[PDB]
Design a protein around this ligand. Structure first.
Ligand SMILES: NC(=O)c1ccc[n+]([C@@H]2O[C@H](COP(=O)([O-])OP(=O)(O)OC[C@H]3O[C@@H](n4cnc5c(N)ncnc54)[C@H](O)[C@@H]3O)[C@@H](O)[C@H]2O)c1
Lengths: 302, 302
């Protein structure tokens, strides 16, 4: 009846999201312990050994953590992506891994739109800016976020083209090359896999029309940083804006006036998105222990 | 008859807008004289002395400039507001004064939406932001810009309430007090008149809900600066974003994290808006000297 639920967040939820988490789980007679703003993963290893269930954000969950959590039955990522979790090692420990699809979608999409206007208007500094209206937007991967970005972009009056090798939808091109050729603005929403890693590089970015802008609210490592640096040095009209800051120091030093990155990923860092993702994670934990519910599971074992 | 048209723009139009102005005016057989990037309202005086028509942006057009333009028959403001022009003295000089309604509406509206997101997301810095979706937006003055903002905000999923005595629309309040009580976000789209000068002050801004935000892409003089300073010192949750930077230095010094201003007014600083505003101004001057049409005239004399 009573399960130990550990919440691992180096980047903590807003108070109201923690309260919601506690309200769902404690009413069902569970214990909730928080691990917030931890420095070393040694802190995590200790507090997890006794945990029955886990709630996580973007926190790296690797083999060493997974094995230390010997009685862990479920890990729920409050959000969409699960590249931070070692699925293979979770399969070994017979641990159910799930996410919370679409819960952060509006936070990320609103930031994506805001970044598009910000990038097209020279970072709100002096100079001749451009308007998003009557321009073509390319959505790279169209799931929950890409869908919302599209909705707002149509209200603004942008023409929409979509690339996604896994779905069938309107205005869809089959080649990712065509998207970069046809679209004045690219928004990336691809999850990080072995296939999408370093996929967006020099050969794709170069094909952009005049004043081409890439907005990245997805993952930094789907970009080939070397290729981006190379084309941005060659073409001084290109704009790159991102919620997932690049590692290289080049971008800040060389591309002022056409490059912006947030100091940290703030796409899901809103009061509302924290509540959605935090409470959805707690409810799925609740359902799993109550009814053996494994909806939204991403892995397979035994 | 070949007329001399002078274009007075301290911050110049985009080149394509200048080209579009010349295409309309030189085909009709008129002369176009550019007065770009001057420093004081004294460079204009001698060059306007033999001007027949004038195109102007936000540039200050006082009695001294009007009296010097003794053969000026028409002044067209490429844009919306005409508080920069001394109408009284124009009436005495028997000069027709026009603006170009709605031409730069999208440049401003897009910037306004971008500023709202920017402001609700801690200027794209680290912190807990808020989402515009599901919040109520108060449009203060619902003309060309106001209406276009409404349109975009509706796609974002904001609820809309309107204060504007000159129009009839749904979800409308009759007291400006009501707008500030009921709306989390306020957006100013009022012209600067006798009535609107210093209207938005302490007593109105008081009534905003928690984390109330005001976006001002209109005019700086509609704000009672000392009143705004007072309420913002009192209420640290309040946010003020503006395209029309205030006179007082207090805002930069004290309200870090909840105050954001552009270094210069950039609402109409786009390729697209320059083209629309400039070419309409040229067509309106052309029609005035061709057929004497006075549509869009904002004054009357004799
Ligand atoms: N930042 C920029 O670059 C930029 C660009 C364009 C306009 N502006 C400013 O924003 C204003 C709006 O532009 P617009 O094209 O929508 O003008 P507009 O005339 O189309 O709309 C202004 C609206 O304000 C309403 N209004 C007038 N007096 C009012 C009062 N006393 N109280 C409440 N509402 C009142 C009018 O009914 C009108 O609908 C302009 O007047 C100008 O001052 C700024």
């Amino acid at each position: 009846a009573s399960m130990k639920i550990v919440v691992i967040t180096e980047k903590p939820f807003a108070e109201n999201a923690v309260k919601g988490i506690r309200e769902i789980l404690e009413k069902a007679g569970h214990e909730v312990v928080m691990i917030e703003k931890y420095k070393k993963k040694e802190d995590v290893i200790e507090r997890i050994k006794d945990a029955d269930g886990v709630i996580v954000r973007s926190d790296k969950i690797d083999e060493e953590i997974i094995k230390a959590g010997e009685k862990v039955k479920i890990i729920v990522r409050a959000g969409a992506g699960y590249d931070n979790i070692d699925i293979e090692a979770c399969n070994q420990g017979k641990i159910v891994v799930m996410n919370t699809p679409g819960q952060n979608r509006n936070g990320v999409a609103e930031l994506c739109i805001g970044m598009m206007i910000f990038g097209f208007r020279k970072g709100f500094k002096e100079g001749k800016g451009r308007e998003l209206k009557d321009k073509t937007l390319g959505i790279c991967g169209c799931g929950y976020v890409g869908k919302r970005v599209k909705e707002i972009a149509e209200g603004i009056g942008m023409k929409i083209k979509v690339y996604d090798p896994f779905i069938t939808t309107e205005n869809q091109v089959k080649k990712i090359e065509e998207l970069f050729e046809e679209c004045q603005v690219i928004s990336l929403h691809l999850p990080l896999t072995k296939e999408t890693k370093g996929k967006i590089g020099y050969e794709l970015i170069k094909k952009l029309p005049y004043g081409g802008m890439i907005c990245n609210t997805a993952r930094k490592e789907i970009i080939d940083e070397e290729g981006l640096i190379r084309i941005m040095r060659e073409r001084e009209d290109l704009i790159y804006i991102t919620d997932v800051a690049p590692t290289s120091k080049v971008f800040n030093n060389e591309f002022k006036g056409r490059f912006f990155a947030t100091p940290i990923k703030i796409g899901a860092e809103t009061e509302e998105s924290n509540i959605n993702a935090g409470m959805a994670a707690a409810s799925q934990i609740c359902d799993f222990f109550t009814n053996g519910t494994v909806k939204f599971q991403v892995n397979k074992f035994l």
